Design an enzyme around this catalytic site. Structure first.
Site, PDB file in Angstrom:
ATOM      1  N   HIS A 152     -73.078 -42.710 -86.688  1.00 31.38           N
ATOM      2  CA  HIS A 152     -72.371 -43.719 -85.895  1.00 31.38           C
ATOM      3  C   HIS A 152     -72.193 -45.001 -86.693  1.00 31.38           C
ATOM      4  O   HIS A 152     -73.180 -45.619 -87.081  1.00 31.38           O
ATOM      5  CB  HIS A 152     -73.150 -44.034 -84.608  1.00 31.38           C
ATOM      6  CG  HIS A 152     -73.084 -42.941 -83.584  1.00 31.38           C
ATOM      7  ND1 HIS A 152     -73.987 -42.870 -82.544  1.00 31.38           N
ATOM      8  CD2 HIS A 152     -72.191 -41.924 -83.479  1.00 31.38           C
ATOM      9  CE1 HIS A 152     -73.624 -41.814 -81.835  1.00 31.38           C
ATOM     10  NE2 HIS A 152     -72.543 -41.207 -82.358  1.00 31.38           N
TER      11      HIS A 152
ATOM     12  N   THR B 275     -74.795 -45.280 -76.408  1.00 30.23           N
ATOM     13  CA  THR B 275     -75.490 -44.068 -75.989  1.00 30.23           C
ATOM     14  C   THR B 275     -76.997 -44.234 -75.832  1.00 30.23           C
ATOM     15  O   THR B 275     -77.715 -43.255 -75.651  1.00 30.23           O
ATOM     16  CB  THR B 275     -75.218 -42.877 -76.934  1.00 30.23           C
ATOM     17  OG1 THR B 275     -75.827 -43.120 -78.209  1.00 30.23           O
ATOM     18  CG2 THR B 275     -73.718 -42.650 -77.087  1.00 30.23           C
ATOM     19  N   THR B 276     -77.469 -45.474 -75.916  1.00 30.14           N
ATOM     20  CA  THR B 276     -78.880 -45.787 -75.705  1.00 30.14           C
ATOM     21  C   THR B 276     -78.882 -47.012 -74.808  1.00 30.14           C
ATOM     22  O   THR B 276     -77.885 -47.726 -74.721  1.00 30.14           O
ATOM     23  CB  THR B 276     -79.640 -46.207 -76.994  1.00 30.14           C
ATOM     24  OG1 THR B 276     -79.134 -47.469 -77.460  1.00 30.14           O
ATOM     25  CG2 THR B 276     -79.512 -45.154 -78.084  1.00 30.14           C
TER      26      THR B 276
ATOM     27  N   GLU C  31     -74.525 -36.099 -80.629  1.00 31.69           N
ATOM     28  CA  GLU C  31     -74.412 -36.615 -79.275  1.00 31.69           C
ATOM     29  C   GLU C  31     -73.138 -36.039 -78.674  1.00 31.69           C
ATOM     30  O   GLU C  31     -73.171 -35.377 -77.628  1.00 31.69           O
ATOM     31  CB  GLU C  31     -74.397 -38.139 -79.306  1.00 31.69           C
ATOM     32  CG  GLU C  31     -75.665 -38.683 -79.940  1.00 31.69           C
ATOM     33  CD  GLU C  31     -76.104 -39.996 -79.352  1.00 31.69           C
ATOM     34  OE1 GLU C  31     -75.342 -40.979 -79.455  1.00 31.69           O
ATOM     35  OE2 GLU C  31     -77.222 -40.043 -78.789  1.00 31.69           O
TER      36      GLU C  31
ATOM     37  N   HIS D 177     -86.236 -45.438 -83.044  1.00 32.96           N
ATOM     38  CA  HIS D 177     -85.311 -44.563 -82.330  1.00 32.96           C
ATOM     39  C   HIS D 177     -84.345 -43.861 -83.279  1.00 32.96           C
ATOM     40  O   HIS D 177     -83.791 -42.813 -82.954  1.00 32.96           O
ATOM     41  CB  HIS D 177     -84.526 -45.366 -81.295  1.00 32.96           C
ATOM     42  CG  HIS D 177     -85.382 -45.961 -80.220  1.00 32.96           C
ATOM     43  ND1 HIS D 177     -85.985 -45.199 -79.244  1.00 32.96           N
ATOM     44  CD2 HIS D 177     -85.748 -47.240 -79.979  1.00 32.96           C
ATOM     45  CE1 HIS D 177     -86.686 -45.983 -78.445  1.00 32.96           C
ATOM     46  NE2 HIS D 177     -86.558 -47.228 -78.869  1.00 32.96           N
TER      47      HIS D 177
ATOM     48  N   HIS E 196     -78.170 -39.602 -85.387  1.00 28.34           N
ATOM     49  CA  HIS E 196     -78.835 -38.905 -84.284  1.00 28.34           C
ATOM     50  C   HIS E 196     -78.945 -37.480 -84.820  1.00 28.34           C
ATOM     51  O   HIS E 196     -77.998 -36.979 -85.434  1.00 28.34           O
ATOM     52  CB  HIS E 196     -77.966 -38.928 -83.029  1.00 28.34           C
ATOM     53  CG  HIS E 196     -77.723 -40.303 -82.493  1.00 28.34           C
ATOM     54  ND1 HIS E 196     -78.575 -40.952 -81.626  1.00 28.34           N
ATOM     55  CD2 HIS E 196     -76.711 -41.173 -82.738  1.00 28.34           C
ATOM     56  CE1 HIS E 196     -78.062 -42.168 -81.380  1.00 28.34           C
ATOM     57  NE2 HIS E 196     -76.929 -42.347 -82.035  1.00 28.34           N
TER      58      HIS E 196
ATOM     59  N   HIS F 152     -76.079 -45.688 -88.127  1.00 31.29           N
ATOM     60  CA  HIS F 152     -77.333 -44.966 -87.889  1.00 31.29           C
ATOM     61  C   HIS F 152     -76.996 -43.517 -87.563  1.00 31.29           C
ATOM     62  O   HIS F 152     -75.819 -43.150 -87.494  1.00 31.29           O
ATOM     63  CB  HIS F 152     -78.111 -45.595 -86.722  1.00 31.29           C
ATOM     64  CG  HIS F 152     -77.349 -45.604 -85.437  1.00 31.29           C
ATOM     65  ND1 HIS F 152     -76.474 -46.602 -85.072  1.00 31.29           N
ATOM     66  CD2 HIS F 152     -77.234 -44.646 -84.482  1.00 31.29           C
ATOM     67  CE1 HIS F 152     -75.854 -46.223 -83.944  1.00 31.29           C
ATOM     68  NE2 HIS F 152     -76.280 -45.040 -83.545  1.00 31.29           N
TER      69      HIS F 152
END
Ligand SMILES: Cc1ccc(CN2CCS(=O)(=O)N(CCc3ccc(S(N)(=O)=O)cc3)C2)cc1
Ligand SMILES: [Zn+2]
Length: 258
Positions: free
Chosen positions: A115, A195-196, A102, A60, A92, A90
């Site tokens: 993040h 957020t996941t 995000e 992911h 995004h 990590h």
């Protein structure tokens, strides 16, 4: 769940109903609507140089994990009551340069968002336990824009080839996360969620006002990662972000005046 056409963010609620909850993240930060809060304490990111353990492609995102057995690498101050230990960081990002982050600011997205994930280890026994409580986690978000090459980022982007396939990992020692921070410590903060999935509403979000810059070459390395395993048909890891969610009356506080 994932970020594809059939298992993406718009469908997560079918599995995790909290997706439609009252303190979901990310959000669109309307700068003129944030409340200046001069009572907030100074934000301090006290990070050591050799607490990193590895870098992994979890299918992911790409994540760097840290030794969190003690309080040597923590975030404190700002909206937080005590220190929260860094567990991992990590990113995004998008397929194109106009999307990827995000959080958005005044409707604007950045190509990527970093993040730094911390937990209240002083109060909870495990990260998972902290992730179930309203005051359990603190995530510091940093926007990434493309521009000049980022020196420290090279260590990370050079390590991506070896973890291009889902489920792979590599040793990653002595990477200081302070090197991915902007020179300013001004921020916006609000109560939100992961957020996941599981989308738990246990995160105090701290979004830094100033973005950091990396080169297009470096950004491109992230897009070379894969959502797929070595045997499966290749599907590049891109657009691994959740769009802004309803504010639902929450108040966004700012450490500065816009
Ligand atoms: C890729 C992936 C693997 C495993 C899980 C399972 N999850 C269970 C609850 S947990 O122990 O709290 N943990 C959450 C992990 C997390 C997610 C999102 C954010 S973010 N994007 O809000 O910073 C920060 C931290 C692992 C979820 C996603
Ligand atoms: Zn994240």
């Amino acid at each position: 769940w994932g970020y594809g056409q059939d298992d993406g963010p718009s469908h997560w609620h079918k599995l995790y109903p909290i997706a439609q909850g009252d303190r979901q993240s990310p959000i669109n930060i309307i700068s003129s609507q944030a409340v200046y809060s001069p009572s907030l304490q100074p934000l301090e990111l006290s990070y050591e140089a050799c607490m990193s353990l590895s870098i992994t492609n979890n299918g992911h995102s790409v994540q760097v994990d840290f030794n969190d057995s003690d309080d040597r690498t923590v975030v404190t101050g700002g909206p937080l009551e005590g220190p929260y230990r860094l567990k991992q960081f990590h990113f995004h990002w998008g397929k194109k340069h106009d999307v990827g982050s995000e959080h958005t600011v005044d409707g604007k997205s950045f190509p990527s968002e970093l993040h730094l994930v911390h937990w209240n280890a002083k109060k909870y026994s495990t990260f998972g336990e902290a992730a179930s409580a309203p005051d359990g986690l603190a995530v510091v978000g940093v926007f990434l824009e493309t521009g000049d090459e980022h020196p420290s980022m090279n260590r990370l982007t050079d390590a991506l080839y070896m973890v291009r396939f889902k489920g792979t990992k590599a040793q990653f020692s002595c990477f200081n996360p302070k090197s991915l921070l902007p020179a300013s410590r001004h921020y916006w903060t609000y109560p939100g969620s992961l957020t996941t999935p599981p989308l738990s509403e246990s995160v105090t979000w701290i979004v830094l006002r100033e973005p950091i810059s990396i080169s297009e070459r470096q950004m491109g390395k992230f897009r070379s990662l894969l959502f797929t395993s070595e045997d499966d048909e290749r599907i590049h890891m891109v657009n691994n972000f959740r769009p802004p969610q309803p504010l639902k009356g929450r108040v966004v506080k700012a450490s500065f005046r816009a």
